[PDB]
Each structure stands twice: as C-alpha cells, then as structure tokens.
Design a protein around this ligand. Structure first.
Ligand SMILES: C[C@@H](N)[C@]12C[C@H]3C[C@H](C[C@H](C3)C1)C2
Ligand SMILES: C[C@@H](N)[C@]12C[C@H]3C[C@H](C[C@H](C3)C1)C2
Ligand SMILES: C[C@@H](N)[C@]12C[C@H]3C[C@H](C[C@H](C3)C1)C2
Ligand SMILES: C[C@@H](N)[C@]12C[C@H]3C[C@H](C[C@H](C3)C1)C2
Lengths: 38, 38, 38, 38
C-alpha cells in the first residue's frame, strides 16, 4: 500500500504529458508577432 | 516507507509547479523584443 | 512484485532524455521568421 | 537496499538542476536574433 509511491509514479506521468502538451508546437507564427506588437 | 520517497515525490511536485510557473509567462512577447534590441 | 517503482524510475528516464533531446534541436530561427511573415 | 528508489530520486534531482541550469544560460536575446539572421 502506501499510496505515496502511487502519487509519485503519477506525478512523473503528469509532468511528462504536460511537457508534451506544452510543446505541442502550433503553426501560424504571425499570430504571435501580432500579439507582441499591434 | 522511508523519507527517500517523501523527498522524491516532493522533488516532482517542485519541478512540476516550477515548469508551469515559467509557462504562465504566455504572451508578453513585446517585452522580449525590447529586451533583445536596445 | 512491485513494478510500480520500475515504471516510475523509467517514466523519469523518459522525461529526462526528452527535455535534453529537445534542447539538442531547436535552432533554425530564420525559417520561423519567414514562414511567419508571409 | 532497493537502490531502485535511490536512482529514481537522483534521476529527479538531475532533471531539476538541469531545467534550472538551462534557464540560467539564456541570458540576452540578441544572441538568438543573430543566430536566425544569416
Ligand atoms: C516534446 C517535444 N520537445 C518533442 C516531442 C516529440 C519527440 C521529441 C522531438 C519532437 C517530437 C518534439 C520532443
Ligand atoms: C503549463 C502550461 N503550458 C499549461 C497551463 C494550463 C494547463 C495546461 C494546458 C494550458 C493551460 C497550458 C498546461
Ligand atoms: C539540456 C541542455 N539544455 C544542456 C545539457 C548540458 C547541461 C546544460 C548545459 C548544456 C549541456 C546544455 C543543459
Ligand atoms: C528556472 C526558472 N523556473 C526560474 C527563473 C527565476 C528564478 C527562479 C524562480 C523563477 C524566476 C523561475 C527559477
């Protein structure tokens, strides 16, 4: 038992899925250029 | 049951909350432009 | 008997080799500047 | 001694000091601009 490990293995899966979820890499770069300037 | 795991699960909670902390900087691109140039 | 940890230590080895692998490939900025301003 | 965890907690300590250490390298942005140009 001791779910402490269970939460540990899941915390690792989270950061992983999250990393990719953030690096998804989207197209359309002009949009970002417009967000910075006008 | 030893603390070794306690520090492990916590080390994950940190790296995670941290990375997300840097991602909340979404947008705000003009600041990066003025930072590079003069 | 308790592979839960085995999968945990491996989940970290992945996220790790990943972040690094992504840091070895991220140059090519002129291609983004063009594909964007079009 | 079930070192499996020892390697796990250490694998996390690395990924952490790494992400940060990498965040202390990117100092100015004019370097990325000169990289793309040409
Ligand atoms: C998460 C991201 N850095 C990626 C995901 C896939 C694996 C690696 C190369 C490419 C495709 C990008 C790393
Ligand atoms: C960590 C960050 N990229 C976000 C934050 C919020 C949760 C996840 C999707 C989206 C919104 C982006 C992850
Ligand atoms: C993973 C990457 N950012 C590196 C890897 C090595 C350690 C840090 C400096 C340099 C060499 C680049 C971070
Ligand atoms: C490494 C990065 N997450 C930061 C950079 C600055 C120092 C620390 C807190 C905050 C601002 C985030 C660490």
């Amino acid at each position: 038992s001791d779910p402490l490990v269970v939460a540990a293995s899941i915390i690792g899966i989270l950061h992983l899925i999250l990393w990719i979820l953030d690096r998804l890499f989207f197209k359309s770069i002009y949009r970002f250029f417009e967000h910075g300037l006008k």
